[PDB]
Symmetry: C5
Subunit: 336 residues, 5 copies
């Protein structure tokens, strides 16, 4: 029996190795397999990865006539001491068990142990959509020991920045992924004391041109088309008025359609500001002609009682495009 | 063996400490980690937190030459007595088990015990949307002992109002969170008797300006634009009529779009009342011109048979804005 | 050891108490905690409640010098006999296990036993939406013994109609809840025989005014607005025709919007009948003017070849509102 | 002890009864309780039913002074031999365990055994939507032994066509259920050999009138309304053109609304063909008037340079309705 | 007892057969039962299949007077050595357990073992929608040993390309499935070494004609209809302008409706490019008439101050269709 080579019954495996002494160092290696999904409304993401642990235990040493190691499955885990790692700020997680538990243990003749498992974890990530769709988001995944402080367990990256590996085909449907790196930081808990924590960082970006073409182009086209009425004879009211009202209807429908396709985030965004400014411009384009018609009627009535192009149109043809250009310049200077 | 220092086999751990005597006090400490999601339709919320318990048991005392404590995992829980805490008015809950059960036990040499676990719980919360979007909601989380009355178990907050800690980065996508505090109250059950209950309270608020800009602004703009026809010559019917009918179409589309983006709550809200009042105003703006046209035709026909501005327009230009202003004043005085 | 006071090893707990004799009566007490959700498409509802059982077993009697009882958790259930209650016509259910199994057992000195647990159950409920939104629905929850007939187990309500208690804050988002009561009835199974069954009944109602304001008001407004063209001079075709076609467009958009916000139930409802009748009225309002224009053109052409208000408008002004009123009277007389 | 009457330890229950001999017959009885849901996109359905088994085992015979049988729960299943039935082409399934496992065993004195359980199963069902909404679908549920061929286990319906019972209140929200019957057929597996399989068949149908009223009626009304322009004087261009363009807009909106409410099945259906044919008719109704206006302008210009009803309208008034009627006749002759 | 024929207690089943020697070959056979669903947003698919293993173990040999084999269920798996196969790049998976574990073991008298199980697995699949709806996608399912390298376990297809079988009725709602084949490739892991991997490949295709009819036909019809205004007299402004603005409104509504029914993939697709090019054409069709009207007014005003068809229309009638045809030719030449 292979379990009789290791004196399982001759030691107490409820205590950590080197108990009463210096803290036992543990190395951690992480390989990211894929990114499964991301939720903007709930602000979380899902990841599947490989977790590996490295430590030495002299109580597991066994004599051997060669340098061959023994491999055991997850059934041996309940009989020996293993680190109790857990993910901080996680929502749900589980370990694959098809067709059996994805747990592997390798024991070297001097007592070096390799512990590997496959896990899927969902973690939270606070997001800010103030600069949508030009926003940039940062995410992090955290690993920490649950019950052992820094005085008993010392956690560190085994090979520094080389301990993180990612798949060549990792991708997301609506985001771009870049800048993977790892960091470390100490955390303090008033109940028990200080703990070591590890971080895995990456950045997310969007596709600017798709949003530009889908949103900004129709609004600017509609704003430019609303300026057509300044070049039509003022005597054609049944052509001037329905053009304006139909432009207002089309702008409203476009705004509703744009709002229907964005994630349900309930605060003000820059795209909303752009669209509402265009709506206000369209509304003023109709008020202008209304006052021009009223003035023309009043002048005609006075002239009749007594017995060319109106300047408002001339000035508006210049004022409206300059104001819109100035607004665009300021808007693109603030939001880059 | 560490489990032999504690005389596990020499006591009956099916009874509470101090059985037949005064009730054993138990302290509780709560640290909130994050808020996961909130459902307005089903009226519930999800929370992840740390639960800690404090009590003393003399049967767990062990001799020692120093003041060092022993730490055990969740496997010891089945062999000793632990409080049976549960969440009142909860829908579903579970305990994290990655990579192992998130349960920790610490035993002091005199018999003081610390019991900690990580849990995620979903709880109900009745909401009222009568004042939407200006409504305010209050939520609560309740903790109570399942099988032990106040005569056997005494539950209390260990440090009063200082026993509640929240994360610095707790946030929700569409709500603002404030005013965390704790309270206590006794509950009575006719089957078994009185129980102690603890509460954790917080308040939720919305973003007023986003809803204002998205809903009230287009309706007021459309109402003001419907008033343009009072300033147009009454002789231009093919300009007067299509403007009104297209304004009605645009108002209907706006109302439908607004209704399509709100949570499906099936009772009357103030925003609905505002929108329908605007719709009624728009409808009357068309009936007015209809009667003005009919009167003008009748007068012309009589004048022809026998062989300026109509007063209705003059009076409407004053009546309509005053009535709308009065309605807005009353509406904003009632709903603040 | 408390389990040694009861002679667990001295009896066979695989048989019911009083085996070979009269049937053992069992009382049941139910307390409803909340209603979680309701699905109209799948026709089911979710409920969380407390289930309590009462019976007497002389084999559990223990000597005592006082009148104090012993309390045990769910671990004792596997060693003694308990009733095998189950929910009829249920889809899924589970028992809460946070932080431990919500199972309590109390044993009196003479052998009276109290068995309580917390469960969440989802049950089916056939619905009829023929009278939507004026429909009324009735639901029921059923409890029955799985393996014991009426000859071996007698099930009944312990205190009649007083055995049902509901929370003061039970509510649903889109329904009104009323009329809680309990009934009993015998069921027959050809495979094994007769069984006792218990029922818990309640009724559901909707908010009539919300649906009225959201649906009936716009259709009646549009129908009334379509009548405006009867009062306009027949000589203004470019005002008469676009008004009708835009009214038809607005009615179609309103009907589509109304259909988009109702539950996906694929059969005819009264609201559909109302909306389609309004659509037919709107269509006829356009056919009338079409024939009036054709007649006027034919008369003018004949008069020219040879070298006031048309009666159709006069009669329609009276016919259309009377017919609509008659239809509304019949419709509201049939559907109340 | 009741388990000592049966010599559990004196036989090997890892082999089937009558091992080395003829195959042991097993009868199956099925009672359908309800249908839970159906998914058109994923092509599956959910069912809850009772499964019963009948067989004889002489090793379970026990002496008795009467003809009374013994009843056992699911805990006895692990100690005796039971058939390993499973559902073919299933996606997910589970056995109810509230408040305990819904498993019952009854043993007769001669060794006849009754085995019953309550299960919920989801099974696949290929569907064809080519004839939507006039399509008809057939579904089936299959039962087969997993590890025993026909040489060792003989599976059959115990009472032929009488072994299937359905609830009186089984129904679906959007489908009609009819024609329940059972069949049998042999299946061959190259790895192990031949197996017996059972089938349970039923048919699904839709509500024709609801779809007719919701889809075909508006399209035919719009097509008929587009014919109004043939009866209007050709001199009124500002009445002729906006009517056509608004009819095209209304047809497009209706088609979009109809497409938004159907299940997302990505291939051509007959309703689409009907709607697009109506759209083509509407488009031609506008091209006709365009050419009529162009011809009239050319004739007027020539007549002026040199110094009634146009036949196109006359012929179109007859051609268009006949062509539409012919198309409807062919369409309703092909699709019944 | 059948388990006593095999000397279970006389061997150590924690080591592979032939330990210290050459690697033990293992054959694998796969039968695909159905495809359950596919998610375009999350880029994954679900499959249900049969997994079979073939290997020889001399420690399981038993004497026999004939050539009959013994069959065991999943309870024997924990007592013997089995291959630890797992799926690479998988998200979630489970083994059916209704009514019992779907695990079968057959042992031949010389020691040949057959191991079969039923599993459902979800696997990732990167997709590219640049050529939507004319895109083609390839998927793969991978099988590999978790803890054994190629030096200890040799994995291969038992019968080459004949080891893969698919159901005759495998289908997907919106995809066409073809070209099933298997391949093998070696993978290298820096932590442990080289492993054998197996692949199962298939291809997916869409229905071109459905997308063509639903998207390209309305846009081309609208573009052609926008050309009607070139044939109308330039003196009819109230007919020329509303036609253009309503065509723009209809194009916008069509684009919004088309975007609302596609999967939410946030980058540019060819259909978007086609639709926006049509929108630009429609916009230019209105700018042309605007300038034609302005020129005509200026000429009339000059002629009046001093005291036929405009060439722009003539040239546009030829230019617009040629440019659209050229664009279609280039577009269909690039995207095939
Ligand atoms: C004096 C004049 O050129 C008229 C023409 C259109 C008119 C406006 C139409 C819309 C509003 C109508 C309301 O009754 C009074 C304020 C508003 C804003 C009017 C103010 C006076 C205007 C500008
Ligand atoms: C007498 C008069 O100034 C006419 C012009 C428009 C007319 C209304 C048009 C809509 C309705 C038509 C219906 O046939 C009678 C009631 C309604 C409400 C009419 C009442 C009489 C009005 C107000
Ligand atoms: C003779 C007459 O007053 C004309 C004016 C409008 C015409 C109708 C327009 C719509 C239809 C057009 C079709 O071509 C013939 C039937 C339909 C229904 C016509 C029948 C004859 C009508 C009623
Ligand atoms: C000659 C004539 O009666 C004209 C009037 C409307 C014209 C059509 C308008 C739409 C198209 C415009 C395009 O420029 C040429 C082809 C199309 C299809 C035209 C062909 C010639 C027509 C039919
Ligand atoms: C000179 C002339 O034929 C006029 C008629 C319509 C005019 C255009 C209308 C839309 C725009 C209005 C804006 O105010 C100036 C640029 C734009 C693009 C105008 C440029 C000059 C045009 C083309
Ligand atoms: C411990 C260590 O070397 N950390 C570095 C980090 O400072 C740097 O930012 C990153 C690349 O950006 O590489 C890693
Ligand atoms: C057994 C019994 O008393 N049942 C009654 C029931 O008949 C009555 O309908 C209900 C109140 O409506 O109260 C309860
Ligand atoms: C074995 C047997 O009798 N099967 C019949 C089947 O042939 C028939 O179609 C059905 C009723 O339609 O009743 C059952
Ligand atoms: C090992 C082997 O024979 N593989 C072949 C593969 O090369 C070929 O592509 C496929 C059919 O396309 O059939 C299989
Ligand atoms: C963005 C708002 C532009 C308003 C332009 C008004 C131009 C008025 C000209 C009056 C000339 C007498
Ligand atoms: C909000 C309803 C306003 C109605 C205004 C009617 C004005 C009628 C004037 C009649 C003058 C003779
Ligand atoms: C609801 C349908 C009403 C139809 C009214 C027709 C009125 C025709 C009057 C003819 C007078 C000669
Ligand atoms: C369905 C297409 C109908 C087209 C009808 C054209 C009628 C043209 C008449 C020409 C008479 C000279
Ligand atoms: C696709 C853009 C087509 C633009 C056609 C302009 C035609 C101008 C003709 C001027 C003749 C003097
Ligand atoms: C590729 C689309 C570009 C749109 C530019 C919009 C600038 C306001
Ligand atoms: C009209 C667009 C101007 C953009 C300026 C951007 C300056 C960073
Ligand atoms: C920031 C938007 C303000 C809109 C005010 C609406 C008042 C009715
Ligand atoms: C026109 C807006 C008036 C708002 C008054 C608010 C009084 C609390
Ligand atoms: C016009 C509404 C009439 C309603 C009558 C209701 C009779 C019960
Ligand atoms: C009950 C609605 C009938 C609609 C008939 C449509 C025939 C094309
Ligand atoms: C105009 C409808 C004709 C329907 C014919 C149906 C022949 C089976
Ligand atoms: C079957 C529909 C064909 C549509 C062709 C569209 C070509 C741009
Ligand atoms: C007008 C459509 C042309 C299509 C050409 C396709 C060449 C492969
Ligand atoms: C701060 C956003 C203002 C938008 C006004 C239309
Ligand atoms: C939009 C401004 C109009 C000013 C009329 C004098
Ligand atoms: C109580 C709300 C009334 C709304 C009327 C339009
Ligand atoms: C909207 C009121 C109109 C009154 C006509 C006299
Ligand atoms: C039975 C409903 C008929 C509806 C006709 C519009
Ligand atoms: C709507 C009926 C019209 C009748 C024309 C004579
Ligand atoms: C085969 C369907 C053709 C549809 C043409 C509009
Ligand atoms: C729709 C056909 C029109 C033919 C013009 C000659
Ligand atoms: C690259 C796509 C360009 C689209 C311009 C309308
Ligand atoms: C669309 C181009 C118009 C050119 C006017 C000269």
């Amino acid at each position: 029996k292979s379990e009789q080579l290791l004196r399982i019954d001759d030691h107490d495996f409820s205590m950590r190795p080197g108990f009463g002494g210096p803290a036992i160092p543990v190395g951690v290696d992480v390989q990211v397999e894929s990114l499964d999904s991301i939720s903007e409304v709930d602000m979380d993401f899902t990841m599947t990865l490989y977790l590996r642990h490295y430590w030495k235990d002299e109580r597991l040493s066994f004599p051997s006539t060669n340098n061959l190691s023994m491999t055991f499955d997850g059934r041996l885990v309940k009989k020996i001491w293993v680190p109790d790692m857990f993910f901080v700020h996680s929502k749900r997680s589980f370990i694959h068990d098809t067709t059996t538990d994805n747990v592997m243990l390798r024991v070297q003749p001097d007592g070096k142990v390799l512990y590997s498992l496959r896990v899927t974890v969902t973690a939270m990530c606070n997001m800010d959509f103030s600069r949508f769709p030009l926003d940039t988001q940062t995410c992090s995944l955290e690993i920490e020991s649950y019950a052992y402080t820094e005085d008993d367990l010392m956690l560190y990256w085994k090979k520094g920045n080389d301990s993180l590996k990612t798949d060549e085909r990792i991708s997301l449907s609506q985001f771009l992924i870049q800048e993977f790196h790892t960091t470390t930081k100490l955390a303090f808990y008033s109940s028990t004391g200080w703990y070591n924590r590890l971080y895995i960082n990456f950045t997310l970006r969007r596709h600017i041109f798709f949003f530009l073409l889908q949103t900004y182009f129709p609004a600017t086209l509609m704003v430019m088309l609303s300026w057509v009425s300044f070049w039509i004879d003022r005597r054609a009211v049944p052509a001037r008025v329905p053009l304006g009202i139909t432009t207002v209807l089309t702008m409203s429908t476009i705004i509703t359609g744009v709002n229907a396709s964005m994630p349900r985030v309930s605060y003000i965004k820059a795209v909303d500001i752009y669209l509402w400014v265009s709506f206000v411009f369209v509304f003023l384009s109709v008020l202008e002609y209304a006052a021009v018609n009223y003035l023309t009627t009043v002048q005609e009535r006075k002239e009749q009682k007594l017995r060319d192009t109106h300047a408002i149109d001339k000035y508006s043809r210049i004022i409206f495009p300059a104001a819109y250009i100035l607004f665009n310049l300021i808007y693109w200077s603030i939001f880059s």
